Scaffold this active site. Sequence first.
Site, mmCIF file in Angstrom:
data_model
loop_
_atom_site.group_PDB
_atom_site.id
_atom_site.type_symbol
_atom_site.label_atom_id
_atom_site.label_comp_id
_atom_site.label_asym_id
_atom_site.label_seq_id
_atom_site.Cartn_x
_atom_site.Cartn_y
_atom_site.Cartn_z
ATOM 1 N N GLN A 73 53.437 -63.229 10.087
ATOM 2 C CA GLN A 73 54.867 -63.548 11.221
ATOM 3 C C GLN A 73 54.747 -64.879 10.742
ATOM 4 O O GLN A 73 56.431 -64.843 10.401
ATOM 5 C CB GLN A 73 53.647 -64.595 12.668
ATOM 6 C CG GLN A 73 54.689 -65.443 12.818
ATOM 7 C CD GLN A 73 54.369 -65.702 14.258
ATOM 8 O OE1 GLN A 73 55.134 -66.444 14.880
ATOM 9 N NE2 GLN A 73 53.515 -65.597 15.357
ATOM 10 N N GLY A 76 56.033 -88.724 23.020
ATOM 11 C CA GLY A 76 57.289 -89.079 22.300
ATOM 12 C C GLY A 76 58.362 -89.115 23.343
ATOM 13 O O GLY A 76 59.550 -89.846 23.301
ATOM 14 N N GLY A 77 58.749 -88.783 25.292
ATOM 15 C CA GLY A 77 58.929 -89.058 25.842
ATOM 16 C C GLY A 77 59.097 -90.280 26.873
ATOM 17 O O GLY A 77 57.653 -90.770 26.113
ATOM 18 N N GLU A 129 47.512 -68.803 12.873
ATOM 19 C CA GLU A 129 48.382 -69.756 13.902
ATOM 20 C C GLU A 129 47.065 -70.692 14.300
ATOM 21 O O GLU A 129 47.597 -71.647 14.318
ATOM 22 C CB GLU A 129 48.639 -68.552 14.954
ATOM 23 C CG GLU A 129 49.376 -69.502 16.400
ATOM 24 C CD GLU A 129 50.150 -69.847 15.702
ATOM 25 O OE1 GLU A 129 51.702 -69.150 15.094
ATOM 26 O OE2 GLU A 129 50.067 -71.087 16.204
ATOM 27 N N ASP A 160 52.772 -70.622 12.640
ATOM 28 C CA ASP A 160 52.998 -68.869 12.244
ATOM 29 C C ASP A 160 54.599 -69.575 12.320
ATOM 30 O O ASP A 160 54.699 -70.381 10.676
ATOM 31 C CB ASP A 160 52.317 -68.280 12.456
ATOM 32 C CG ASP A 160 50.998 -67.567 12.068
ATOM 33 O OD1 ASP A 160 50.810 -68.451 11.560
ATOM 34 O OD2 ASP A 160 50.678 -66.777 12.486
#
Lengths: 427, 427
Positions: free
Chosen positions: B16, B259-260, B139, B168
């Site tokens: 991937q 982060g908001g 992954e 990935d």
Amino acid sequence: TKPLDGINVLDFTHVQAGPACTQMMGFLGANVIKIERRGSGDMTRGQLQDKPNVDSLYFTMFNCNKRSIELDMKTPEGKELLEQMIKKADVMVENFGPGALDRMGFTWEYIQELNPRVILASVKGYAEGHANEHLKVYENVAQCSGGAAATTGFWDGPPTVSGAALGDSNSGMHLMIGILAALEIRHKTGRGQKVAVAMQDAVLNLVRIKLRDQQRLERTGILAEYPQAQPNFAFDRDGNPLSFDNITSVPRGGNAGGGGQPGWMLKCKGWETDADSYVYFTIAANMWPQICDMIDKPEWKDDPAYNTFEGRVDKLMDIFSFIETKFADKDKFEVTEWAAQYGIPCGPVMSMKELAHDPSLQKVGTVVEVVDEIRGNHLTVGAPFKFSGFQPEITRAPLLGEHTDEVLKELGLDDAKIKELHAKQVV
Amino acid sequence: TKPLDGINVLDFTHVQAGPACTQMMGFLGANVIKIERRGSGDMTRGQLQDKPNVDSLYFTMFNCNKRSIELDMKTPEGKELLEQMIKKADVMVENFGPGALDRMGFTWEYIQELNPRVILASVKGYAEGHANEHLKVYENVAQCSGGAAATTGFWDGPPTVSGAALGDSNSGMHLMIGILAALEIRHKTGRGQKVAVAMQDAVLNLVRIKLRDQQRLERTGILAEYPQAQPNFAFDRDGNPLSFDNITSVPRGGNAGGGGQPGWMLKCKGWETDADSYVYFTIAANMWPQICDMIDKPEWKDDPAYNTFEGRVDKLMDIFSFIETKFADKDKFEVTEWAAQYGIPCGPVMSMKELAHDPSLQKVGTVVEVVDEIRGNHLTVGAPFKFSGFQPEITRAPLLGEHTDEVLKELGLDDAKIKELHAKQVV
């Protein structure tokens, strides 16, 4: 030399997405001039400060390798300054609302007139032309809009947000690709272009594997690698069985393998009192004999109920449960070292504390101690791409308007007009 | 003209991360020649197929805009062909194990001798020089190693993987930045470079905000916006109040803002039977009056324990529970439009079913129907960056070795030589 040495970036960005993009450009050598609203500047400066009246870590970890100029862009003098700076810029980056930059007096067409070589790069919530192109979008809303929340967490729980900034930092990194691509064509055309990344689209690009799954689900009615494919394994809060008989949209798979081989999050010694005492353990189809040796089940090697992916579908969660019993007296590093003996992809859940002080990440320049004599030193994440020919040199984030006069001098302004701009409160 | 028109990519990648990189380069016009192990090729071809003996959706959604050549690289004739191809390549991309390409006979030093302009780009698990440089990573192992799993999910549940491919595709997108950066610098130096991205580092870059939080936590002993900072709200294994008293590493915050600004995932009508009937609702500080209006509690507008982020810290989760009660008779789109007429920050959890068939995403070229006359059409994710000067032209994934002879003819080989290579089982 560094890749972006000599690239002038006129940086209107604030918050996380835009600033992440321009910071990383700065790490690769770009001359980043951060335009900040006079008197206040980037909202991250005052968001979740750890010391009163000191720029927060939110700001400093997203604004290294930049210079700050204050500018009142509503004034005729402010707009005049922008025009001169646009003429010296290679890239303009912004994350204002849709149309905001047009309303400020700078349409793409007017920008091309000022500088035919300048690239205009924007972070948007939704793509231009989307039904929602005018909506305001922040981190977790982008995760929800792009399919990530729907496919993250557990089948008996809610959609869940990722701790990773799939919305903000991810969109900024995508915009950096856009910008670099525009630089590459400009070598051919001698002309700048407009490039935009929607936060929804950046999220969707990372959830490509779940669009695979949606189509597989539509076509076949089952996702064999999901926990729900195991008969009578998954249930909702009320105890109702969750099978693919009635699932029509890609569900939450807990700690299933995703684009990886099947796997799960397994407890190690201390899990009761240590939130991060786990490994991720994978059952790769070509590694069954190795796994069988590891867990002392040689009888499972030649048994077709166990020795193919297809054979394991009805029992994979049982197998994980059994493997987990083998880790009860081993910590996550002991388990990782043990699995590694077998060549089995397996690794620890690294805590943020562990990562912050890991000598390897500091050795390779991925966690970097920034020298900041004003605020005190701090850690940041450096360039994730390592190059044979150079290393980033990361320097402290600017104070608000710290480089105003410095930048004006470079625009060829003499001391008299600088005085006047200050006097007039343009700067 | 497209940005990477004329860029010849020698593509060894599989699975991937690497293929997502080279695919996206192909979308931007690159000439991608996918080298596949003769007889089998990329493992994704056979992974979770929806039709027997047809290349899977995993393969087709990561390998559009590529040509396939089969090559036995452990033959001397295969190595010679590779040397010829390296001399015409701009970029070589690989994601083999550590040292694997060296062992194949192509060290970076040898590669530079063959072609001084070629860029060598690699996906790795851990960065070169790392203590864990030799661990195998896919992954979710990368999500665990990079801090995402530790900080995703709930305080009373396990570390949780994101449905988004943080390991990935994210690493692949980061590698694309590195490759384009290497192209930028080659215009200056005339020389190619070696560039590498570790999956751990790509993940850590997106969890920058959690490293912000780890420092805040170490410096102050608290993260006031986290659920654990509300006294007596979050509960542990036996059922006692959580607090930052005993938390030394960034914890899981459930559906908190990250982060908001502060937010949460709120149920909408049908949530009992529709796993994606939710909105994300943010309590932005300045939007507080509008929220008091929408929810019909103008009392709280002036109440000091309600109208301040600091005031709310002790009962923010109690506020969310009440806002949620207002949505019980409305679907996620009805809730969103209701908030949008008060300017309030709010967005629906989009299901994969919804996104796969959304008219807007197909209009903007973000979800693209690929014409595949061999296998039947499928959907994919297009380019998430939109450019003023061009649109990608997405074309179907190659059959295994479909372009072997075509590519060999481009190398200048004649039909007799090509026939010989087939007979010797080199291609």
